[PDB]
Amino acid sequence: RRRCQQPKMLSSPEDTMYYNQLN
Amino acid sequence: AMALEQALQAARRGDLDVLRSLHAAGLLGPSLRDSLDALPVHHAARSGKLHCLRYLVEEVALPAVSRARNGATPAHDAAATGYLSCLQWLLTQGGCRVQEKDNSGATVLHLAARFGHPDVVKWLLYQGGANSAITTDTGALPIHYAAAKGDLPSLKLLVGHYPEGVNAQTNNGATPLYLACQEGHLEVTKYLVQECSADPHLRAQDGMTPLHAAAQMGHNPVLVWLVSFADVSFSEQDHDGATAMHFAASRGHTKVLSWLLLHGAEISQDLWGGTPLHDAAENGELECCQILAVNGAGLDVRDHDGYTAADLAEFNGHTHCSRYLRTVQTL
């Protein structure tokens, strides 16, 4: 339960994946 | 597929001669995209290869406003990677508009803040005309991104440009300060609270305070400062009754857990009857189990299902924790 709560994110995971693969 | 790899590699490397050769052979075009629908213009822009970017847009006629799968244009790529020269060219000669959005609603100002590029943020605000009051589809302002990144120079620029953003909440309730605490950025946290009158009591939609977020993510320097200097209580509870100690124990953050206990934080049950020892045991966090047990956690306390912490460890297969807890109880 509590451990699986994710941090608050500002973008979607698909968005984060894209911008992370620019480098 | 071979022309594609050659084109993308040349655009990233700045190999203009290879792009010229591919163009002469008729092998460059607007369908020649990678698996995320990015064109050679994206790959040049994200790599700072301005001469290749200009060749691809000006001569090959690949569109400067082309969009990848998530809606990112080459200007979004350039802002996210910090390549200001490419971004400036796209926004002036290239015909990209400073307020163009990806699918989420993010602008180049959001992305420059997200990835901590204050030279880009500064140019966008004071020469490029970018708007600092734009929220994405999650409610995020550029200031939220700068705070989450811990980019103090960009944050200062964005607070000065749009001071009403300081206490703005995203759709899930996070303030810039919440996000700075979540990501462990102490100097940004101090700046927000001390210089911007940021409210440390504004909670996210689930009742979590910035202190909860710091404990959940293990950032003891932030937690220590909030308690010691910012008048934040370490006893506050989220909508489930969880304290900072629950979050730290659930994710193995022994330093936060130790500091809380050292300073008198109580070992309490949430609304489901679980103590932080339940959280540590359920998740196999042996060192947190040991710290809690040595400091007076009620080993026999049962949650609203009737389970002790040792029971939860056993049901989750954390035999190191259950064996430890059951031997300690005998003492």
Residue numbers in the entry:
A (entry chain C): 1250 to 1272
B (entry chain A): 0 to 330
What does the paper say about this structure?
The THDI mediates binding of Myo3 to its cargo protein Espin1 (Ectoplasmic specialization protein 1) and allows Myo3 to transport Espin1 to the tips of actin bundle-based structures such as filopodia and stereocilia. Espin1 is the longest isoform in the family and contains a stretch of ankyrin repeats (AR) in its N-terminus. Here, we discover that both Myo3a and Myo3b contain two highly similar repeat sequences in their THDI region, each capable of independently binding to Espin1-AR with high affinity. The high resolution crystal structures of each of the two binding sequences from Myo3b in complex with Espin1-AR not only reveal the molecular basis governing the specific interaction between Myo3 and Espin1, but also allow us to discern the Myo3-mediated release of the auto-inhibition mechanism of Espin1.
To understand the molecular basis of the Espin1/Myo3 interaction, we solved the crystal structure of the Espin1-AR/Myo3b-ARB1 complex at 1.65 Å resolution. The structure revealed that Espin1-AR contains 10 ANK repeats, instead of 8 as predicted earlier. The 10 ANK repeats form a left-handed superhelix with the αA helices forming the inner groove and the αB helices forming the outer surface. Clear additional electron densities lining the inner groove of the ANK repeats allowed us to build the bound Myo3b-ARB1 peptide model with high confidence. The ARB1 binds to Espin1-AR in an antiparallel manner, similar to the binding mode between ANK repeats from Ankyrin R/B/G and their targets as well as between ANKRA2/RFXANK and their targets, suggesting that elongated inner grooves are common target binding sites of ANK repeats in general. The ARB1 spans nearly the entire inner groove, covering ~1230 Å2 of solvent accessible area. The N-terminal of ARB1 adopts an extended structure and binds to the C-terminal of Espin1-AR. The C-terminal of ARB1 forms an α-helix and binds to the N-terminal half of Espin1-AR. The first binding site is formed by the repeats 2–4 of Espin1-AR and binds to the C-terminal α-helix of ARB1. Two absolutely conserved tyrosine residues (Tyr1267ARB1 and Tyr1268ARB1, the double tyrosine (‘YY’) motif; Figure 3B) and Leu1271ARB1 in the next turn insert into the hydrophobic pocket in the N-terminal of Espin1-AR. The two highly conserved Arg residues at the beginning of Myo3b-ARB1 (Arg1251ARB1 and Arg1252ARB1) insert into the negatively charged pocket.
